[model samples]
Target: DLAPCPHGVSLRFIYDYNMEYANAFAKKVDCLTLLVYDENGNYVDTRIVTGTELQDENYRMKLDLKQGNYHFVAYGGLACNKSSFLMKYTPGEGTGYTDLQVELDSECLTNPRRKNLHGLYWGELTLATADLYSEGTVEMMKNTNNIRVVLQQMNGEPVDDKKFEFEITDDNILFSYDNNLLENGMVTYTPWAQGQASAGFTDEGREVVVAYAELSTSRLMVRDWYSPKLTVRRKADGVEIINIPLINYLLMLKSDLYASMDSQEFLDRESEWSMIFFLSPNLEWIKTYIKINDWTVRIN
Candidate 1:
C-alpha cells in the first residue's frame, strides 16, 4: 500500500485577550509567543505572532512539523515595550524548558501612568501531533499583579507619603519557564505613586489624611529560602522605621481565614493586594495590628 501523510497539522491560537487583575479589567494584548518543545523536553522552535496578526481574534497555521507528540508554551506581553523590559534568553539545540528565563530592566518613567506594567499571560498545551489538528483551547493565566499601600497615624496625625522611601526587595528578577523565581540578586520594586491622600471622613466628621504608595510587580514567587521584604524609611533623614517581611503579613491573613493552600500556592494564585499600616508618633509602624485588603489582622 502506497500512503503518504501531511507534514503537520493546522493549528490555531485562540487567545481571549481579556484580563482581570485586582479589581481592574482590561482588553489589551500587544503580542503572543509560542515555544515549541519535543517529546524529550528539548527546545524545538518558537512562533512569535504580532498584535496585528492576532487582530482577527483567530489565527490558524499549518506548520511543517513532523507528526509526533509536542509541547507548547505561550507567553503574552513578551514583545511589549521592547526597549524597557528585556527577556535575556536564547533557545538553542541543548536548551531545556527550565533553561529559559526572563529578565526585566526596570524602567522608572516620568509619567506614573506610563510606568504601569503590561498584561502578562502564560499558557501551555501538550498535543499528540497529527495531519489534522484538534480543537483545544490553550487557557492562559494572568501574571501581572498590583498592590497599593497606605499608612496613617492612629491619632489622626498627618503622614506625608512623599517624605518616606517605599521599597519592596526580592529575588524575582529572573524567572524560569514554569514561572518559578530563580536565584538572582535582589530586585527592588519602588513606588510609582506616593503622596498624601484622603481616606474619606470618619463617622465623627474627622478628615483622615493618609500616606499612600503603589507597587507594580511583574511576577511573585514563594520559596522556603526566599522571602519578599517591605522596608520603609524617612527620605528626609534616612531613618529606617518600618521593616517587615511581607510574606509573613500576607500569611497572617491566610491563617486567620483558615486558607487551605500552602504559602507557595497562595502567593502564586493571589496576584493583588492592598495594605494599610498604622504609624506611631515616632513614625514607627504599629505592629500590634494592620490591615490587608478588607481584613484587619492583629499580631501578638
Candidate 2:
C-alpha cells in the first residue's frame, strides 16, 4: 500500500570565502554541516557533508532542506573569519536539487578599489553670516586649528586612518604631506595660505590625490582620509586617482549595504554619498552565505 504526502520547496544560498587554493595546496579539509531548527529554535535533523562530496572549489555550498518550518545553517570549519553560512529552511517539500556555483567577487573576494570623487562638503561652519557663519562652523574653525577634509563611511566613521599618502599639484608643482600621527585617526597638513606665504603661489588648478586605506575593524571607522590637496587656478579642475584592490571595493559595497540594513540615521546624514541598505531581518542569513554563481556554469 502507498500513502500520499504533500510537499513544497524553496531555494536559498550561502557564500563561503575560506578556501586556501592559492596556498601551496597543503593539508586542508573543508566541511559543511546543515542543521535544521524548529520554530522553537530546537535542532530537528542535522546533515553533515564536505567539499569533496559537493565536488566544487570556490568555497560555495549548496543545500536542500526537506519541507518543514525550520532554520538551517550550512557552515564550514576553518578560521571563523574565513567561514560563512549559505541558507535557511522552512516547512515545505524539499526544494529542487542543484549546486549553487560560487564565483569570487573581484573587489570583495580579491582587493578593494575606488569609485569616483562624487562631491565635497565642509564640516566646519564658523565664519560670520552674510559673510556666512553657523555654530558648527565657528566650533570647527576655532576648536580645530587643522581643517581636515576626511573621507568617511555612511556612519561618518573615518576610513582606514593608516594609508593617508598624497601629493599636491596646482598644475605640475609637487609636494607631499607627512603622515606621522595617522595612528590617532587624524591627517594634518598646512593650509594653502600657510604654504603660499612661505613659497610664492603659482596659478595652476589641478591637484593629484593618493591614499592607502585598509579595513581593520568591523565596527566601521573611517577607512582613510588624506590631507586636503588644494590647487589654485583661474578655473578649478582636477581628478584624484586611487589604485585600490578589487576585494576591498566589494567589502565596502557590502558594508555599505550591511550598515544600511538597520533603519538608522547614519547614512541619511551623509546625503552626498551613494549607498545600499539591507531592509530584511534575514539579511545576515541571506546575503552573507549565498553566492550568485552564473547560471551558465557546470556542476559535477
Candidate 3:
C-alpha cells in the first residue's frame, strides 16, 4: 500500500566519546527530549522518552511514524533544560538548521558542581514505502569540553602534589571553580583555581610521572571558530608557566581520525586524541591540531 505504511523508528542512546562502542561509559539514561522535523525543515513535534522504555539491557526505542523524510534532534542531561535553549529548523538553507543556544544558570556555571554532564544526538532519516522499520543510532556526545594540564620535570617525570592556577582572559567564556564550606561557618571560594593534583603512583602501581590537572566547562558557549587564551601559573612562585590560545578540544575528539586507522587502531589511539595540550621541557605550550587523515602539533 502506498499509504503511509505505519512506519516505525527505533533509537538507541549511548555515550561513546571515541565512537568505538567500547561501552566503557555506557549506561541507561532516564530522560531524553527529542525534537522532530519534516523534510522541508519544518518543526514537527517534540517527545519525551524514558530510558526504562527505550534504554535498558538493550538500548532501543520503537516509535510509530508516518512514511516520510524527517530529521531528529535529541538531547538530555542533568544541567540541560529544554526551556533554556532555542532550536530552529529551516529548510533549504545553510546547515538545514539554525543555532541551538543553551542558556545556563549563572550559579551552575560558577559553582564546583556535580552532575553537569549533557548529551546530544542528531541525524536525518528517510522512510520509504518499502520500509517497515527505520533503525539508527544516536551517538551521544558530552556537551562539555575539558583542558588537561600535565606538569612534568625536564626528565619527563610528572610533578607531585603541585598546585597551579588558571585564568581565562576572554570574557565570552566562564569557568567553574571549587566551592568549599569551611568549618568556621564560612565558604572558601577560589575563582581562578580550576583543578589540582597530587604526585603518586597509579592504580596499576606505575610510578607517577607528573602532576596532571583537568578543567571542564560547558561547550555550548564556546565558539569553535575562534581561539581563546588560557594562562596557567605556579601557585608557589606565581610564575606563569603555560600561556596559549585554546580551541574546542571536543572538536578534535569528535574528528574523523578513523579514516586513517582501522576500528581497533582508532580505539587503541583514542586516548591520545584527547590530549590536545601539553607542557614540554622547554616550558613551551604544545597544541594539537586534528585532521581527517593526519594530525599536527604546534609549539609556542
Candidate 4:
C-alpha cells in the first residue's frame, strides 16, 4: 500500500546557539544532505539544507513527508561529504510538521507496518502439550539463553495434568498438540531470562493458540492462582476484544464424539467455541487469565 503522510503535519525547532559556537573552531563546516529509505533499504528520497549566511549558526527546518515507514540519513558539510545522521520514521498525527522537531540531520519517515509484528516476515507455528508433561517447551533466547515466565498454578501447585491441549484449524484443516503439562505441584511456568516465546510477528495473521496452559484438571474455578479472563485489543485505537475460555465444555473429554485423538477431533472441539482473529497490518493487545483452586493470575 502507498503510505501517505497525514496532511498539515508541521515541525518546529529549538536552536542550540551555544553548542554551535562551541564547535565552530573544530571544522566550521556548513550544509547537510538528508536521505530516506523504506524498510527494505530501497532509496525513497533525499533533502539538503545549507548553513545560514546571516546567523552563521545552527538552525532547523521542517518539511512535509508522505506518511509511512521510512529510514532517513543526513550528512553535514558544504559538499554533503561529511559524517551523516539517520533515523527510523513511524510518525503519528503532526508527524511531518510542528510539535515534532528533528534537531539532528539524518531523517526517515515511513508507516509502522513495515516492522511485520504480525509474522508477515516469518510464518506461524502450532504445538500441543499433554497435561503433567513439558508445559510445552519454551523456545530459547539467542544471546543469553535465559527465559522469564510466571507459571499459573492452583492451590499452590503447578498445573501439570493431561487435561489440556491446543488445536489449530486453518484452511479447513485441523492440528493438535498435547501442551506442556505441569508437574512438581507448580502452577505457573515462566522460564528465567526469556520473555514470552510466543510473542512475535507472523504472516498469516491468524489467531492460533499462542500458549494454552491447563487451568484445572476436571473443572473451572476462579482463584488468585488462576486467572479466568483473556482480552485482545488493537494498538492504533484503544478498541478491540479477543477472549476465550480456558476450558469451555464442562467435561468435554478427549474420547467423546470425533474422539479419535486426531486433528479432526481437536478441530471439532475448536469449532464449539468462538475464536479471535489477529488481523494483519495492525497492532494487537492480548490478555490472559486463570482461575482455579481459589487463585488467579491476570497476564497482559
- By lDDT, the best candidate is 1
lDDT of 1 by residue, 110-191 (tens): 3455456666667777877766554445656656667788889988778888789888887776667787667877777787
For candidate 1, the lDDT comes to 0.70
Q: List candidate 3 segments past 4 Å from native.
A: 1-5, 13-30, 53-57, 78-99, 103-105, 114-132, 155-163, 167-211, 219-225, 235-238, 247-300
List model 2 lDDT by residue over 1-300, tens digit each.
574342322222222112211321112234434444554445555455543543443333233334445444333331122322123233463431111111111232122221111111111111111111111100100001111122222222223323233222111111111101122232222222111011122245323221122111101122243322321111123322222222233334335444543221222122122111111221111122211111111111
Candidate 2's TM-score reads 0.24
Task: Report RMSD (Å) for each prediction in the order shown.
Answer: 4.2, 25.2, 10.3, 25.9
Residue pairs with colliding backbones in model 3 are 157-209, 158-209, 158-210, 159-210, 159-211, 161-199
For model 3, what is the C-alpha lDDT against the true structure? 0.44
Write out the backbone clash pairs for model 1.
none
Error in Å for residue 200 of model 1: 1.2
* Candidate 3 or 2, higher lDDT: 3
Best by TM-score: 1
Q: Predictions ranked by TM-score, top down?
A: 1, 3, 2, 4
The C-alpha stretches of model 2 lying farther than 4 A from their native spots are 1-10, 14-33, 47-68, 73-81, 84-207, 219-300
Per-residue lDDT, model 2, residue 283, is 13
